[PDB]
Amino acid sequence: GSHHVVPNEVVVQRLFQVKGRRVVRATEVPVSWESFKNGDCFILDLGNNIHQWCGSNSNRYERLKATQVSKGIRDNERSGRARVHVSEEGTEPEAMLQVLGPKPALPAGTEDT
Numbered sequence: 001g002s003h004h005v006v007p008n009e010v011v012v013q014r015l016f017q018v019k020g021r022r023v024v025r026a027t028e029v030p031v032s033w034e035s036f037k038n039g040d041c042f043i044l045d046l047g048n049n050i051h052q053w054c055g056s057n058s059n060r061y062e063r064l065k066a067t068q069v070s071k072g073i074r075d076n077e078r079s080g081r082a083r084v085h086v087s088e089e090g091t092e093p094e095a096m097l098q099v100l101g102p103k104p105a106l107p108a109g110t111e112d113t
């Protein structure tokens with residue numbers, strides 16, 4: 001047509017919360033800094049790139065599991081064809097700030113149960 005004014009679709013994005021005391025679960029949550037808590041880990045899946053983030057008060061078990069979830073998306077869902085970027089509070093890649101916007105101060109979240 002003569003005039004193309006409708007925005008194109010952008011790549012699907014997902015965010016997982018990686019949380020637990022010793023039984024650690026990955027739960028899909030809304031893609032927003034409001035999902036983030038400094039007590040847990042988060043996996044921001046941007047398709048060809050996956051951002052693995054752990055908070056300063058995340059526990060060992062969560063950090064281990066975050067590695068498994070990112071690798072698992074890459075390997076089981078992307079056929080190995082994706083880049084994992086590991087970051088932490090305050091070291092987030094620009095690509096993650098582009099998606100989530102400027103980073104606010106983050107709360108601790110709920111104790112793991």
Ligand SMILES: [Ca+2]
Nearest residue numbers: 039040058112
């Ligand atoms: Ca936690």
Ligand SMILES: [Ca+2]
Nearest residue numbers: 039059111112
């Ligand atoms: Ca705790």
Ligand SMILES: [Cl-]
Nearest residue numbers: 001002003004
């Ligand atoms: Cl056209």
Ligand SMILES: [Cl-]
Nearest residue numbers: 084085086093
């Ligand atoms: Cl990177």
